[PDB]
Design a protein around this nucleic acid. Structure first.
Length: 476
RNA sequence: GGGCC
RNA sequence: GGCCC
Protein backbone atom coordinates (compact mmCIF):
# COMPACT_ATOMS: atom_id res chain seq x y z
CA UNK A 1 0.00 0.00 0.00
CA UNK A 2 0.89 3.68 0.27
CA UNK A 3 1.74 5.49 3.50
CA UNK A 4 -0.12 8.80 3.15
CA UNK A 5 -0.02 10.16 6.72
CA UNK A 6 2.02 9.60 9.89
CA UNK A 7 0.98 11.08 13.25
CA UNK A 8 2.44 10.96 16.76
CA UNK A 9 -0.30 10.79 19.40
CA UNK A 10 0.43 10.77 23.16
CA UNK A 11 -0.88 7.23 23.78
CA UNK A 12 1.34 4.13 23.71
CA UNK A 13 0.23 0.84 22.18
CA UNK A 14 2.80 -1.47 23.80
CA UNK A 15 3.96 -4.45 21.72
CA UNK A 16 5.54 -7.79 22.68
CA UNK A 17 9.33 -7.89 22.30
CA UNK A 18 10.29 -11.25 23.85
CA UNK A 19 10.12 -14.55 21.94
CA UNK A 20 8.23 -17.64 23.12
CA UNK A 21 10.33 -19.80 20.77
CA UNK A 22 13.36 -21.73 22.03
CA UNK A 23 15.74 -24.21 20.34
CA UNK A 24 15.08 -27.95 20.69
CA UNK A 25 17.48 -30.92 20.92
CA UNK A 26 17.33 -31.11 17.09
CA UNK A 27 18.79 -27.60 16.70
CA UNK A 28 22.31 -28.77 17.63
CA UNK A 29 21.99 -31.64 15.14
CA UNK A 30 20.54 -29.91 12.05
CA UNK A 31 22.06 -26.41 12.59
CA UNK A 32 19.45 -24.59 10.46
CA UNK A 33 19.99 -21.22 8.75
CA UNK A 34 16.87 -20.11 10.64
CA UNK A 35 15.98 -18.29 13.86
CA UNK A 36 13.22 -16.44 15.73
CA UNK A 37 12.29 -13.10 14.15
CA UNK A 38 13.62 -9.92 15.79
CA UNK A 39 10.97 -8.45 18.09
CA UNK A 40 13.10 -5.64 19.53
CA UNK A 41 15.19 -2.79 18.08
CA UNK A 42 17.92 -3.77 20.56
CA UNK A 43 18.20 -7.37 19.29
CA UNK A 44 21.97 -8.06 18.99
CA UNK A 45 21.44 -10.32 15.94
CA UNK A 46 20.30 -7.33 13.84
CA UNK A 47 22.57 -5.58 11.33
CA UNK A 48 24.28 -2.46 12.71
CA UNK A 49 21.90 0.15 11.25
CA UNK A 50 18.53 -1.60 10.97
CA UNK A 51 15.50 0.31 12.28
CA UNK A 52 12.89 -2.41 12.87
CA UNK A 53 9.86 -0.06 12.87
CA UNK A 54 10.93 1.26 9.45
CA UNK A 55 11.62 -2.19 7.92
CA UNK A 56 8.22 -3.45 9.16
CA UNK A 57 6.31 -0.93 7.02
CA UNK A 58 8.82 -0.90 4.12
CA UNK A 59 6.48 -3.29 2.25
CA UNK A 60 4.13 -0.32 1.79
CA UNK A 61 5.75 1.66 -1.04
CA UNK A 62 3.03 2.09 -3.70
CA UNK A 63 -0.69 2.04 -4.48
CA UNK A 64 -0.77 1.62 -8.28
CA UNK A 65 -3.52 3.55 -10.05
CA UNK A 66 -5.06 1.59 -12.92
CA UNK A 67 -6.16 3.28 -16.16
CA UNK A 68 -9.83 3.48 -17.18
CA UNK A 69 -9.30 0.73 -19.78
CA UNK A 70 -7.47 -1.54 -17.29
CA UNK A 71 -10.16 -0.99 -14.63
CA UNK A 72 -12.84 -1.94 -17.20
CA UNK A 73 -10.97 -5.13 -18.13
CA UNK A 74 -10.44 -5.99 -14.44
CA UNK A 75 -14.18 -5.60 -13.71
CA UNK A 76 -14.94 -7.92 -16.64
CA UNK A 77 -12.53 -10.56 -15.27
CA UNK A 78 -13.85 -10.14 -11.71
CA UNK A 79 -17.45 -10.61 -12.90
CA UNK A 80 -16.47 -13.68 -14.96
CA UNK A 81 -14.72 -15.33 -11.98
CA UNK A 82 -17.61 -14.40 -9.65
CA UNK A 83 -19.99 -15.99 -12.17
CA UNK A 84 -18.01 -19.25 -12.02
CA UNK A 85 -17.57 -19.03 -8.24
CA UNK A 86 -21.27 -18.52 -7.40
CA UNK A 87 -22.38 -21.06 -10.02
CA UNK A 88 -20.47 -23.77 -8.13
CA UNK A 89 -21.23 -22.55 -4.58
CA UNK A 90 -24.82 -21.34 -5.01
CA UNK A 91 -26.43 -18.14 -3.73
CA UNK A 92 -27.12 -19.16 -0.12
CA UNK A 93 -25.09 -16.26 1.29
CA UNK A 94 -27.50 -14.83 3.88
CA UNK A 95 -25.94 -13.11 6.94
CA UNK A 96 -24.79 -15.33 9.81
CA UNK A 97 -26.47 -14.75 13.17
CA UNK A 98 -24.45 -13.38 16.11
CA UNK A 99 -24.61 -16.91 17.60
CA UNK A 100 -23.39 -18.69 14.44
CA UNK A 101 -20.61 -16.14 13.79
CA UNK A 102 -19.06 -16.85 17.21
CA UNK A 103 -19.79 -20.60 17.43
CA UNK A 104 -19.03 -21.37 13.76
CA UNK A 105 -21.10 -23.31 11.24
CA UNK A 106 -20.44 -26.37 9.05
CA UNK A 107 -17.17 -25.55 7.27
CA UNK A 108 -16.37 -22.56 9.50
CA UNK A 109 -14.30 -22.82 12.70
CA UNK A 110 -15.31 -21.00 15.90
CA UNK A 111 -13.87 -17.63 16.96
CA UNK A 112 -10.88 -17.87 19.31
CA UNK A 113 -11.84 -16.85 22.87
CA UNK A 114 -8.37 -15.90 24.17
CA UNK A 115 -6.76 -14.05 21.23
CA UNK A 116 -6.11 -10.29 20.88
CA UNK A 117 -9.28 -8.11 21.06
CA UNK A 118 -7.83 -5.08 19.21
CA UNK A 119 -8.39 -1.34 19.73
CA UNK A 120 -9.53 0.51 21.74
CA UNK A 121 -10.12 -2.56 23.95
CA UNK A 122 -6.38 -3.25 24.40
CA UNK A 123 -5.80 0.23 25.86
CA UNK A 124 -8.68 -0.32 28.31
CA UNK A 125 -7.22 -3.63 29.57
CA UNK A 126 -10.12 -5.71 28.23
CA UNK A 127 -9.93 -9.18 26.68
CA UNK A 128 -12.25 -10.95 24.22
CA UNK A 129 -13.86 -12.96 27.04
CA UNK A 130 -14.99 -9.79 28.81
CA UNK A 131 -16.65 -8.35 25.68
CA UNK A 132 -18.08 -11.55 24.18
CA UNK A 133 -19.53 -14.75 25.68
CA UNK A 134 -17.82 -17.54 23.73
CA UNK A 135 -19.76 -20.31 25.52
CA UNK A 136 -23.34 -19.10 24.95
CA UNK A 137 -22.64 -17.15 21.74
CA UNK A 138 -23.75 -13.71 22.95
CA UNK A 139 -22.25 -10.20 22.96
CA UNK A 140 -21.78 -7.53 25.64
CA UNK A 141 -22.97 -3.88 25.59
CA UNK A 142 -19.77 -2.65 23.89
CA UNK A 143 -19.90 -5.00 20.87
CA UNK A 144 -23.70 -4.54 20.68
CA UNK A 145 -23.35 -0.77 20.14
CA UNK A 146 -20.53 -1.19 17.60
CA UNK A 147 -22.58 -3.59 15.43
CA UNK A 148 -25.34 -0.97 15.10
CA UNK A 149 -22.80 1.63 13.91
CA UNK A 150 -21.64 -0.77 11.19
CA UNK A 151 -25.25 -1.23 10.01
CA UNK A 152 -25.48 2.57 9.62
CA UNK A 153 -22.11 2.40 7.77
CA UNK A 154 -20.63 5.12 10.02
CA UNK A 155 -18.18 2.89 11.92
CA UNK A 156 -14.46 3.75 11.92
CA UNK A 157 -11.53 1.83 13.43
CA UNK A 158 -7.76 1.41 13.80
CA UNK A 159 -5.63 -1.70 13.24
CA UNK A 160 -3.29 -2.81 16.03
CA UNK A 161 0.14 -3.71 14.64
CA UNK A 162 1.55 -6.92 16.15
CA UNK A 163 5.02 -8.40 15.65
CA UNK A 164 4.82 -11.98 14.40
CA UNK A 165 6.83 -14.26 16.71
CA UNK A 166 7.93 -16.94 14.24
CA UNK A 167 10.92 -18.74 12.75
CA UNK A 168 12.45 -16.92 9.77
CA UNK A 169 15.56 -17.40 7.57
CA UNK A 170 18.61 -15.84 9.26
CA UNK A 171 19.19 -13.37 6.40
CA UNK A 172 15.73 -11.88 7.05
CA UNK A 173 16.19 -11.92 10.85
CA UNK A 174 19.46 -10.01 10.42
CA UNK A 175 17.78 -7.54 8.03
CA UNK A 176 14.84 -7.10 10.43
CA UNK A 177 12.27 -8.37 7.94
CA UNK A 178 9.90 -9.37 10.75
CA UNK A 179 6.38 -10.06 9.50
CA UNK A 180 3.43 -8.20 10.98
CA UNK A 181 -0.12 -9.05 12.06
CA UNK A 182 -2.72 -6.31 11.66
CA UNK A 183 -5.05 -7.05 14.58
CA UNK A 184 -8.53 -5.67 13.87
CA UNK A 185 -11.15 -4.90 16.56
CA UNK A 186 -13.02 -8.07 17.59
CA UNK A 187 -16.40 -6.58 16.61
CA UNK A 188 -15.15 -5.87 13.07
CA UNK A 189 -14.05 -9.52 12.79
CA UNK A 190 -17.45 -10.66 14.10
CA UNK A 191 -19.43 -8.50 11.64
CA UNK A 192 -17.26 -9.59 8.67
CA UNK A 193 -18.03 -13.20 9.66
CA UNK A 194 -21.72 -12.24 9.84
CA UNK A 195 -21.56 -10.70 6.35
CA UNK A 196 -19.54 -13.33 4.45
CA UNK A 197 -19.17 -16.33 6.81
CA UNK A 198 -21.76 -18.45 4.97
CA UNK A 199 -19.89 -17.78 1.72
CA UNK A 200 -16.57 -18.58 3.43
CA UNK A 201 -17.84 -21.95 4.71
CA UNK A 202 -19.05 -22.87 1.20
CA UNK A 203 -15.66 -22.08 -0.37
CA UNK A 204 -13.88 -24.35 2.13
CA UNK A 205 -16.37 -27.14 1.39
CA UNK A 206 -16.05 -26.70 -2.38
CA UNK A 207 -12.26 -26.21 -2.56
CA UNK A 208 -10.53 -27.31 -5.76
CA UNK A 209 -9.46 -26.33 -9.32
CA UNK A 210 -13.07 -25.54 -10.37
CA UNK A 211 -13.14 -22.47 -8.09
CA UNK A 212 -9.34 -22.02 -8.12
CA UNK A 213 -9.13 -22.20 -4.33
CA UNK A 214 -7.33 -24.62 -2.02
CA UNK A 215 -8.45 -22.77 1.13
CA UNK A 216 -9.92 -25.38 3.48
CA UNK A 217 -8.05 -28.28 1.85
CA UNK A 218 -6.35 -31.19 3.59
CA UNK A 219 -3.08 -31.84 1.69
CA UNK A 220 -2.95 -35.44 3.02
CA UNK A 221 -6.17 -36.37 1.24
CA UNK A 222 -6.39 -33.61 -1.39
CA UNK A 223 -2.94 -33.97 -3.02
CA UNK A 224 -4.30 -37.02 -4.87
CA UNK A 225 -7.23 -34.94 -6.17
CA UNK A 226 -5.05 -31.93 -7.08
CA UNK A 227 -2.13 -33.99 -8.44
CA UNK A 228 -4.19 -36.09 -10.87
CA UNK A 229 -5.94 -32.96 -12.19
CA UNK A 230 -2.76 -31.00 -13.02
CA UNK A 231 -1.06 -34.13 -14.42
CA UNK A 232 -3.44 -33.93 -17.41
CA UNK A 233 -1.98 -30.66 -18.77
CA UNK A 234 0.99 -30.03 -21.08
CA UNK A 235 2.42 -27.02 -19.20
CA UNK A 236 2.49 -26.30 -15.45
CA UNK A 237 3.79 -23.06 -13.93
CA UNK A 238 5.11 -22.35 -10.44
CA UNK A 239 4.52 -18.61 -10.01
CA UNK A 240 5.90 -16.53 -7.12
CA UNK A 241 4.75 -13.07 -6.02
CA UNK A 242 6.74 -10.53 -4.01
CA UNK A 243 4.65 -8.87 -1.26
CA UNK A 244 1.30 -10.00 -2.75
CA UNK A 245 -0.91 -8.84 0.15
CA UNK A 246 0.71 -5.39 0.39
CA UNK A 247 0.67 -4.77 -3.38
CA UNK A 248 -3.10 -5.13 -3.86
CA UNK A 249 -4.07 -1.72 -5.24
CA UNK A 250 -7.21 0.12 -4.11
CA UNK A 251 -8.75 -0.05 -7.61
CA UNK A 252 -8.40 -3.85 -7.81
CA UNK A 253 -9.71 -4.33 -4.25
CA UNK A 254 -12.74 -2.05 -4.71
CA UNK A 255 -13.76 -3.58 -8.06
CA UNK A 256 -13.39 -7.17 -6.75
CA UNK A 257 -15.56 -6.44 -3.69
CA UNK A 258 -18.18 -4.77 -5.94
CA UNK A 259 -18.39 -7.71 -8.36
CA UNK A 260 -18.08 -10.74 -6.06
CA UNK A 261 -20.19 -9.68 -3.07
CA UNK A 262 -23.28 -8.34 -4.89
CA UNK A 263 -26.76 -8.50 -3.34
CA UNK A 264 -27.92 -10.39 -6.46
CA UNK A 265 -25.67 -13.28 -5.32
CA UNK A 266 -27.53 -13.46 -1.98
CA UNK A 267 -25.35 -11.13 0.09
CA UNK A 268 -26.44 -8.47 2.58
CA UNK A 269 -25.73 -4.93 1.22
CA UNK A 270 -23.17 -4.43 4.03
CA UNK A 271 -20.94 -7.30 2.85
CA UNK A 272 -19.37 -5.02 0.22
CA UNK A 273 -19.18 -2.12 2.71
CA UNK A 274 -17.30 -3.95 5.50
CA UNK A 275 -14.78 -5.39 3.02
CA UNK A 276 -14.21 -1.91 1.53
CA UNK A 277 -13.16 -0.66 5.01
CA UNK A 278 -9.97 -2.73 4.58
CA UNK A 279 -8.82 -0.56 1.66
CA UNK A 280 -8.05 2.66 3.57
CA UNK A 281 -6.79 1.79 7.06
CA UNK A 282 -5.14 3.39 10.09
CA UNK A 283 -2.40 1.40 11.84
CA UNK A 284 -1.27 1.80 15.46
CA UNK A 285 2.33 0.92 16.28
CA UNK A 286 3.48 2.30 19.66
CA UNK A 287 3.18 6.12 19.57
CA UNK A 288 2.87 6.33 15.77
CA UNK A 289 -0.36 6.21 13.75
CA UNK A 290 0.16 5.29 10.10
CA UNK A 291 -2.56 5.77 7.46
CA UNK A 292 -2.25 3.32 4.56
CA UNK A 293 -4.10 3.37 1.22
CA UNK A 294 -4.44 0.02 -0.55
CA UNK A 295 -3.27 -3.45 0.47
CA UNK A 296 -4.82 -6.16 2.63
CA UNK A 297 -4.57 -6.35 6.44
CA UNK A 298 -3.62 -9.85 7.65
CA UNK A 299 -5.69 -9.99 10.85
CA UNK A 300 -8.96 -9.30 9.05
CA UNK A 301 -11.54 -12.07 8.77
CA UNK A 302 -11.20 -14.03 5.49
CA UNK A 303 -7.80 -12.68 4.35
CA UNK A 304 -6.88 -16.05 2.77
CA UNK A 305 -10.14 -16.19 0.79
CA UNK A 306 -9.87 -12.56 -0.36
CA UNK A 307 -6.22 -13.01 -1.42
CA UNK A 308 -7.18 -16.25 -3.22
CA UNK A 309 -10.05 -14.57 -5.13
CA UNK A 310 -7.71 -11.73 -6.18
CA UNK A 311 -5.11 -14.25 -7.40
CA UNK A 312 -7.71 -15.90 -9.67
CA UNK A 313 -8.81 -12.57 -11.16
CA UNK A 314 -5.18 -11.44 -11.63
CA UNK A 315 -4.36 -14.47 -13.80
CA UNK A 316 -7.46 -13.99 -15.99
CA UNK A 317 -6.71 -10.25 -16.25
CA UNK A 318 -3.06 -10.72 -17.26
CA UNK A 319 -3.89 -13.37 -19.88
CA UNK A 320 -6.69 -11.24 -21.36
CA UNK A 321 -4.41 -8.19 -21.46
CA UNK A 322 -1.92 -10.19 -23.57
CA UNK A 323 -3.96 -12.74 -25.54
CA UNK A 324 -7.21 -12.57 -27.50
CA UNK A 325 -10.06 -15.02 -26.81
CA UNK A 326 -9.03 -15.99 -23.27
CA UNK A 327 -11.73 -17.57 -21.09
CA UNK A 328 -11.80 -19.47 -17.77
CA UNK A 329 -11.42 -22.78 -19.65
CA UNK A 330 -8.23 -21.63 -21.44
CA UNK A 331 -6.27 -22.62 -18.32
CA UNK A 332 -6.64 -24.17 -14.88
CA UNK A 333 -5.34 -23.00 -11.49
CA UNK A 334 -5.28 -23.59 -7.76
CA UNK A 335 -4.54 -20.81 -5.27
CA UNK A 336 -4.06 -20.40 -1.52
CA UNK A 337 -3.59 -16.71 -0.82
CA UNK A 338 -0.49 -15.69 -2.80
CA UNK A 339 0.56 -19.32 -3.39
CA UNK A 340 -0.38 -20.48 -6.89
CA UNK A 341 -0.07 -23.30 -9.44
CA UNK A 342 -1.23 -22.60 -13.03
CA UNK A 343 -1.63 -25.10 -15.91
CA UNK A 344 -2.73 -25.13 -19.57
CA UNK A 345 -2.56 -27.17 -22.78
CA UNK A 346 -1.70 -23.92 -24.57
CA UNK A 347 1.93 -22.75 -24.56
CA UNK A 348 1.33 -19.57 -22.55
CA UNK A 349 4.22 -17.08 -22.43
CA UNK A 350 4.34 -16.29 -18.71
CA UNK A 351 7.50 -14.22 -19.20
CA UNK A 352 5.46 -11.91 -21.46
CA UNK A 353 2.76 -11.63 -18.75
CA UNK A 354 5.17 -9.84 -16.36
CA UNK A 355 4.33 -6.21 -17.33
CA UNK A 356 0.61 -7.12 -17.26
CA UNK A 357 0.91 -8.18 -13.61
CA UNK A 358 2.93 -4.97 -13.08
CA UNK A 359 -0.09 -2.90 -14.20
CA UNK A 360 -1.69 -4.33 -11.04
CA UNK A 361 1.44 -3.56 -9.00
CA UNK A 362 2.36 -7.23 -8.73
CA UNK A 363 5.78 -8.76 -9.48
CA UNK A 364 5.89 -12.36 -10.74
CA UNK A 365 8.92 -14.67 -10.92
CA UNK A 366 9.37 -18.43 -11.45
CA UNK A 367 9.75 -20.39 -8.19
CA UNK A 368 12.87 -22.27 -9.34
CA UNK A 369 15.92 -20.03 -9.81
CA UNK A 370 17.67 -22.38 -12.26
CA UNK A 371 16.32 -20.72 -15.41
CA UNK A 372 16.45 -16.99 -16.18
CA UNK A 373 12.66 -16.81 -16.62
CA UNK A 374 9.48 -18.83 -17.15
CA UNK A 375 9.81 -21.98 -19.29
CA UNK A 376 7.41 -24.49 -20.88
CA UNK A 377 7.09 -28.26 -20.40
CA UNK A 378 7.02 -28.42 -16.59
CA UNK A 379 4.78 -30.96 -14.83
CA UNK A 380 2.96 -31.16 -11.48
CA UNK A 381 5.85 -33.25 -10.08
CA UNK A 382 8.19 -30.27 -10.63
CA UNK A 383 6.29 -27.59 -8.67
CA UNK A 384 5.73 -26.73 -5.00
CA UNK A 385 2.39 -25.79 -3.41
CA UNK A 386 1.87 -24.95 0.29
CA UNK A 387 5.58 -25.75 0.83
CA UNK A 388 4.87 -29.29 -0.43
CA UNK A 389 6.08 -31.15 -3.52
CA UNK A 390 3.87 -33.51 -5.54
CA UNK A 391 5.41 -36.98 -5.25
CA UNK A 392 4.00 -40.36 -6.24
CA UNK A 393 3.67 -42.95 -3.48
CA UNK A 394 4.88 -46.20 -5.06
CA UNK A 395 2.99 -48.38 -2.55
CA UNK A 396 -0.48 -47.04 -3.40
CA UNK A 397 -0.12 -45.09 -6.65
CA UNK A 398 -1.43 -41.93 -4.97
CA UNK A 399 0.14 -38.46 -4.91
CA UNK A 400 1.57 -37.46 -1.51
CA UNK A 401 2.65 -34.05 -0.11
CA UNK A 402 6.42 -34.06 0.47
CA UNK A 403 8.06 -31.16 2.33
CA UNK A 404 11.77 -30.50 1.84
CA UNK A 405 14.00 -32.00 4.55
CA UNK A 406 15.63 -28.62 5.30
CA UNK A 407 12.17 -27.18 5.97
CA UNK A 408 11.22 -30.05 8.31
CA UNK A 409 14.60 -29.71 10.07
CA UNK A 410 14.00 -25.97 10.59
CA UNK A 411 10.52 -26.70 11.97
CA UNK A 412 11.87 -29.37 14.36
CA UNK A 413 14.73 -27.13 15.58
CA UNK A 414 12.51 -24.69 17.51
CA UNK A 415 9.43 -24.88 19.75
CA UNK A 416 7.38 -22.83 22.20
CA UNK A 417 7.97 -23.84 25.82
CA UNK A 418 6.13 -26.97 27.00
CA UNK A 419 4.69 -27.77 23.55
CA UNK A 420 7.43 -30.02 22.09
CA UNK A 421 5.57 -33.35 22.43
CA UNK A 422 2.38 -32.01 20.80
CA UNK A 423 4.50 -30.36 18.08
CA UNK A 424 6.37 -33.62 17.31
CA UNK A 425 3.09 -35.51 16.72
CA UNK A 426 1.94 -32.78 14.33
CA UNK A 427 5.25 -32.65 12.40
CA UNK A 428 5.32 -36.47 12.22
CA UNK A 429 2.14 -36.27 10.09
CA UNK A 430 4.07 -34.03 7.70
CA UNK A 431 7.32 -36.03 7.74
CA UNK A 432 5.79 -39.47 6.98
CA UNK A 433 5.64 -38.64 3.25
CA UNK A 434 9.43 -38.19 3.11
CA UNK A 435 9.84 -41.98 3.41
CA UNK A 436 11.03 -44.31 6.22
CA UNK A 437 14.75 -43.43 5.96
CA UNK A 438 14.20 -39.66 6.16
CA UNK A 439 11.43 -39.94 8.78
CA UNK A 440 13.79 -41.92 11.03
CA UNK A 441 16.66 -39.44 10.53
CA UNK A 442 14.49 -36.38 11.32
CA UNK A 443 13.21 -37.76 14.64
CA UNK A 444 16.50 -39.39 15.79
CA UNK A 445 17.47 -36.51 18.15
CA UNK A 446 14.12 -36.83 20.00
CA UNK A 447 14.25 -40.62 20.57
CA UNK A 448 14.06 -41.57 24.26
CA UNK A 449 13.06 -38.00 25.19
CA UNK A 450 9.59 -37.90 23.61
CA UNK A 451 7.01 -40.24 22.09
CA UNK A 452 7.55 -40.50 18.34
CA UNK A 453 4.86 -42.21 16.22
CA UNK A 454 6.08 -45.19 14.18
CA UNK A 455 6.37 -44.64 10.43
CA UNK A 456 4.10 -47.68 9.97
CA UNK A 457 1.15 -46.31 11.99
CA UNK A 458 1.15 -42.96 10.19
CA UNK A 459 1.46 -44.63 6.78
CA UNK A 460 -1.57 -46.86 7.41
CA UNK A 461 -3.50 -43.85 8.73
CA UNK A 462 -2.70 -41.93 5.52
CA UNK A 463 -3.75 -44.78 3.18
CA UNK A 464 -7.21 -44.93 4.79
CA UNK A 465 -7.44 -41.12 4.79
CA UNK A 466 -6.83 -40.74 1.03
CA UNK A 467 -8.85 -43.83 0.01
CA UNK A 468 -10.92 -45.91 2.45
CA UNK A 469 -11.74 -48.57 -0.15
CA UNK A 470 -8.05 -49.11 -1.03
CA UNK A 471 -7.21 -49.82 2.63
CA UNK A 472 -10.09 -52.31 2.87
CA UNK A 473 -9.13 -53.93 -0.47
CA UNK A 474 -5.64 -54.59 0.97
CA UNK A 475 -7.29 -57.25 3.16
CA UNK A 476 -8.47 -59.24 0.11
C1' G B 1 -8.84 -14.33 10.49
C1' G B 2 -8.24 -18.98 7.42
C1' G B 3 -8.15 -23.99 7.31
C1' C B 4 -6.41 -28.82 8.27
C1' C B 5 -4.59 -32.72 11.96
C1' G C 1 -1.21 -26.87 20.77
C1' G C 2 1.25 -27.54 15.67
C1' C C 3 1.63 -26.58 10.44
C1' C C 4 0.48 -23.85 6.12
C1' C C 5 -1.31 -19.08 4.19
Amino acid sequence: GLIVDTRDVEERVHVMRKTKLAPTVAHGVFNPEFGPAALSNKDPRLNEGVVLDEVIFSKHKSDTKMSAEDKALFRRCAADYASRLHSVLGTANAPLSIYEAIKGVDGLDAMEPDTAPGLPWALQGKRRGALIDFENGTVGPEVEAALKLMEKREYKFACQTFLKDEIRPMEKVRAGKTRIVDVLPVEHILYTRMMIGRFCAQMHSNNGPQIGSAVGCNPDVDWQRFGTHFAQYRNVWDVDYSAFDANHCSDAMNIMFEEVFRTEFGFHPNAEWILKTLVNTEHAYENKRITVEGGMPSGCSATSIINTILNNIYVLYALRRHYEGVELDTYTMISYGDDIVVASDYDLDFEALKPHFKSLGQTITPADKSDKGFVLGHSITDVTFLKRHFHMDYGTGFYKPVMASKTLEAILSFARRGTIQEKLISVAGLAVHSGPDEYRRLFEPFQGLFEIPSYRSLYLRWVNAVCGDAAALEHH
